[model samples]
Target: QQPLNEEFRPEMLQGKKVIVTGASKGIGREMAYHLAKMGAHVVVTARSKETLQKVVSHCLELGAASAHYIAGTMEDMTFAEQFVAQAGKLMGGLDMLILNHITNTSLNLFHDDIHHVRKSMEVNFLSYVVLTVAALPMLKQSNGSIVVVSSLAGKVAYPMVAAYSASKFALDGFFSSIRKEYSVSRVNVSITLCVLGLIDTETAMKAVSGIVHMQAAPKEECALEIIKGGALRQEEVYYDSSLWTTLLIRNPSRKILEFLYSTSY
Candidate 1:
């Protein structure tokens, strides 16, 4: 695991109420585990009730003060608002909200499905807006934080991931816009966008099994970095140091190809 930065306040999450979407597995599950262990009350949400229950159990076992779940699909925009409302009421007040859910990970862009495109936007981007709007009141009360878990795709494009990349890019646009709004208003709440590279999580690794053999970043470390960013109120967390290298490099080949399609929208 990466060492926690000493500059950040220790136990900064103690007594805080947090909501983590997609907490049933992969990155979200790891994030909920570490946040709960760090002395925060966590409310997890996802479509899988069985997996969510297991996550809640794990959080309690890991010394969380309290943990629960609100099982539902992010496709329902109303659920986003209600999820935040329910977590705030149950946990007393909200301090952190992690928007981490995503849908449709298949890498077959040639077989276009317009409905899949809409579903991706609803789950990845629109639901975030709904949840943030609902959490605003409680967040304003506590001067809280919002952490958006995005991907490298948000900043750059890759092949066979049009839907996923579009949603991630939309998240960057939406949250970055909101970040500026909060800054202008002098709101104490901090908004962070976590741009992660390829990770070694089971689901992700399984999806890319035949693609490459490069070592993927550890999921546990990714989770810790996200928690660190939230606790320290960093503007953004580029989970891997190499993500900066990619962002700084000006390769025209892939960039031009992606830009061509981006112009279509």
Candidate 2:
């Protein structure tokens, strides 16, 4: 049950090059701000180049060593790949990769929305994979970390987000598997999975205003905790304002089972 042995200091990120996806707004943007305040080199991306310019400008104003932006959609795997390549060139190389983009979705019943399902997987899950692949070399060289942002629905089931939840669960399985491979292969790159609860982002607030019935946590703190987890290289970081949800999200019994299964007879 005890993990994440190290403490995170903001100076750890100073002068480091980081790529933050979905950073035009919401938690992604807030994380970029925190990183910039720590003097990290920041390259933020989202679909709107105009919006990205604002984030880039703010990062520079906040004291980032360097700030850059490349406007493109994560839904395009080609764009996801190219974004990392360009972002790496802009910052000289990469130190940390933060994957946090999701296609615009809303609370709706499951129906004939096959396009929605496929798109959610493509943007939420597959693009993350693509970005990681593109950034792995630079990250391996730096012994850097990857922070994958997820949600309560990702770990446990929550209605009105089936497509979104599926993508998040896929992120968990795929990233966790490769972490084991990194262990055996002597790759020093770290992967931190952030399991967040309800955050008061614009999109989230609009989606669940009346129905969610729970208090929303501040996005700034949510963003900071994610950066801390990534810097500390923690395996998983749980950030739910809910008392019971945090405890229930952790499953040591399942961890033990998975651990045992990984070894051969």
Candidate 3:
């Protein structure tokens, strides 16, 4: 894999049309602002109408070519599918689709909560598929990219938040397969999977503060890296390069399994 350059030019995204899910907060929010500052036409979404409105307003003020939002939950597959069409219509074409949404989860042992697990799958995994499928035509026309914001837990399992980990792992499997199929079929679409570690988001901090002890990376930097990776059409990028090396191990499954079993919650 080629190393990314030290400088990322804003003109790389000039006049691009982008859709960022969960754009009301955290990494998604920062990404929306970054794209806006780069002069992209951005369409953002979240369940919070108030926050979504504010984000769009700020995006326009930050120099977005145009900004819009469709506020709703991704748990509704219909809404997930329709949002893509709506975004395409709003922006006239799509250059990038950033899937950054996930359901709220609490740290707990995986037991007796099948409903919670189902909800997590619906929001975290299914919605991504729906949106990607819906945006296929536009992406094909534009030779666009799909940026999936996944997690470290998806690569190596840890204790607690089993549902969230499962959802992210599903993303890795499903998107990786689709990426290969697209490549083989001569489809002009790129999929960039961003494997993120702990980020300094309010929700993440509140959920893992007592149990996880690690320095969280700034969400702004993480967001910038995601954009850069997608712009460069990288197949995969990691927030921590050490973790990237671990994923390259020849027999990583055995080591990751042992680590998971030995660690205590």
Top candidate (lDDT): 2
| Candidate 3 ranges with C-alpha deviation above 4 Å | 1-7, 241-265
- The C-alpha lDDT values of all candidates are 0.84, 0.91, 0.89
Q: Rank the candidates by TM-score, best first.
A: 2, 3, 1
**List of clashing residue pairs for candidate 3:** none
Q: Which residue segments of model 2 deviate by more than 4 Å? A: 1-4
Put down candidate 3 lDDT per residue, 1-265, tens digits, no spaces.
Answer: 2334656687989999999999999999999999999999999999999999999999999999999999999989899999999999999989999999999888898889999999999999999999999999999999899999998888887888799999999998899778757855888798998988888898988877876777778889889999999988887778853554446623458548745754643
| Candidate 3, position 253, lDDT | 80
lDDT preference between candidates 1 and 2, better one:
2
TM-score of each: 0.88, 0.96, 0.89
Query: How far out, in Å, is residue 20 in model 3?
Result: 0.2
Error of 3 at 31 (Å): 0.5
Off by over 4 Å in 1: 1-6, 241-265
TM-score of 2: 0.96
Model 1 agreement with the true structure over 68-150: per-residue lDDT tens digits: 99999999988778888889888999998998989856777547587888898989899998998899889989988888998
Task: Extract clashing residue pairs from model 1.
Answer: none
